[PDB]
Design an enzyme around this catalytic site. Structure first.
Site, PDB file in Angstrom:
ATOM      1  N   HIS A 181       0.823  -1.202   0.000  1.00  0.00           N
ATOM      2  CA  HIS A 181       0.000   0.000   0.000  1.00  0.00           C
ATOM      3  C   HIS A 181       0.859   1.255   0.000  1.00  0.00           C
ATOM      4  O   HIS A 181       0.429   2.298  -0.505  1.00  0.00           O
ATOM      5  CB  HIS A 181      -0.951  -0.004   1.196  1.00  0.00           C
ATOM      6  N   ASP A 217      -0.638  -7.767   2.016  1.00  0.00           N
ATOM      7  CA  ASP A 217      -0.432  -6.367   1.620  1.00  0.00           C
ATOM      8  C   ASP A 217       1.059  -6.041   1.496  1.00  0.00           C
ATOM      9  O   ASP A 217       1.514  -4.974   1.904  1.00  0.00           O
ATOM     10  CB  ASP A 217      -1.141  -5.418   2.599  1.00  0.00           C
ATOM     11  N   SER A 274       5.999   2.583   8.216  1.00  0.00           N
ATOM     12  CA  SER A 274       5.730   1.164   8.032  1.00  0.00           C
ATOM     13  C   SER A 274       6.604   0.610   6.921  1.00  0.00           C
ATOM     14  O   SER A 274       6.510   1.033   5.766  1.00  0.00           O
ATOM     15  CB  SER A 274       4.249   0.941   7.737  1.00  0.00           C
TER      16      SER A 274
END
EC number: 3.4.21.90
Lengths: 160, 52, 160, 160, 52, 159
Positions: C37, C59, C111
């Site tokens: 993402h 993801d 992240s």
């Protein structure tokens, strides 16, 4: 001096029934454990605005601890060795299954104390515990060696 | 309507004696919340272990 | 000071979305794990001209790491004890399964941090992890005791 | 300086009609006495959350004293000599039947003051009491020499 | 029903003009709470003196 | 004076379940509560006050009691390009608008009155996105004529 230094820092919460503290809602490992028969609002809007049904077989509530109270909410080990676990009304140690303190600990208005190590690890929450001759016993709710949440009850248990 | 009644009896009794027993067997389990027991495979209405 | 010295030495790569870093493409145990993402180019031609499909259940993207950076990329143990794994925005420890850090860690633009021991061993990579309380969570992608790559995620995790 | 030392320690309770202290609930000889036309919540959960009907001839609420304030509340004598009874806005004395103070005692926000001896004995409560030339009077509720609760009222009394 | 009505009139009027007057004659008495008067013997619906 | 004069002023926070989301400010008679800001207030002369919606401006009004009358935030309608000041810094702009340095805080701030060093309210915060280096201020203010208007840059802020 960890029996009062560490515990005052802990985010337990008393339950004022019309101003009368009858027990301590302790936020423990994610979800909160209000002693259920203890009734009253609590000193936190994120705790007193918290609808909760019954874990009636153990006589506890649950959570729904929101995302602004968690994450150091008395993290712990499920098991316990025979350790000197301490709180406001003194310390406990017992060797087989149970928890028993010297006489005069106070169960009324007290049930709700999380049972922290000197290290600061919960192993139980107070329920009660009549005097067994000299000492005062402790009924609690705790965890199994398997981690299974049980409760420990001697005969003729105390109120909250 | 008797036959419709008793199944509604057997419904709500099954509701309580499932949902109470589904509320139980997670209260012993989802209160410790690590709770390493892969015998959730007895209710499968209260679900989602912690990979353990 | 290993939480910043050892990490700055590592070959992590920020993902600039038109100059705007949104996550870190880190090269771990052979292959590379780009947070999916997170989008944008990367500061490595051995990683920028590299095509990758979706590990959309987790993801993530994947590798396809060229052989030039091979022979030193963030070797690790799949398991983890309750360790004080550390990185730029501090250290994490949790006793069984999850990962939680002091509050204000920052989960936006971060992240992609690999989760390194003081030894420097990646047991996880950040997925985010909501503000929980006085500390903050970490959803991650990590490995089972069996070595199985999994993702750990509390309820309502964060963006990247 | 007993007019403030003894009096601040006393457990009167102001009545905030939406924040507006318009009178003082006082907890007297067991039962509690609200000036009843004064309305609003009160700063005690023992006192706020209680329903009370009307002593409309005297215009007061009534008991509603939980047992925890029992064993200490405003014991007194029903009678009074012509003494210097005291409270926040000064003292009072009169010879025959009544209560009159120096001018400027304040009627608004005041009715509810209990009427305490230097010894600490509540002989009455403020209702009102118009200016009488030099002095200001006090309409009150008090007690007969027989102990019968009565109200002594000059003409043209005050708001509360 | 008229005769039943007027007694219900005479009931509720007797309710108020007893219970109000029973609420009174204790408000003068049960607010001083010592209240040494053994002439409670006029209502005997609001009861229990203090041995005095 | 950006904090001395302001702390002395009778601004009032709107706690939504304890969470401040804006300040009800008592401005020349009628109080101007930000309307989309929800929650009770730390003034019961103000919290027990029912108020309808000026939804075109997204405000409430007064209905302010008379105890607070005779001392509330006297002001002028117009404004020069002055260094108006409050908690989160000062503001100045030349023609029509209001812009402050970065990081003034749009959240939990909209409700600040906009006071001169003299202490005169020419505006109240509405919002106003970051403007490159500086930050805007969507406001509600008064026309040069006096007409109460709202000033809004594109893509304004929450409260």
């Amino acid at each position: 001096q960890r029996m009062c230094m560490k515990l005052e820092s802990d985010k337990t919460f008393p339950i004022m029934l019309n101003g009368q503290v009858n027990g301590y809602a302790c936020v423990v490992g994610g979800r909160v454990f209000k002693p259920l028969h203890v009734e009253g609002r609590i000193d936190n809007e994120q705790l007193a605005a918290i609808k909760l049904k019954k874990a009636s077989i153990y006589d506890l509530e649950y959570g729904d601890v929101p995302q602004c109270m968690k994450s150091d909410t008395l993290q712990y080990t499920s098991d316990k060795p025979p350790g000197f676990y301490n709180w406001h009304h003194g310390a406990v140690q017992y060797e087989n299954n149970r928890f028993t303190v010297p006489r005069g600990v106070g169960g009324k208005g007290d049930s709700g104390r999380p049972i922290l190590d000197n290290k600061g690890r919960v192993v139980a929450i107070v329920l009660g515990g009549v005097n067994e001759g000299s000492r005062t016993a402790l009924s609690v709710v705790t965890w199994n060696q398997k981690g299974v949440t049980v409760k420990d009850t001697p005969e003729g248990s105390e109120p909250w | 309507c008797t036959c419709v009644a008793i199944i509604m009896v057997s419904c709500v009794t099954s509701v309580w004696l499932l949902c109470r027993t589904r509320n139980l067997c997670i209260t012993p389990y989802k209160l410790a919340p690590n709770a390493q027991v892969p015998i959730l495979l007895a209710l499968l209405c209260c679900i989602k272990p912690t990979r353990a």
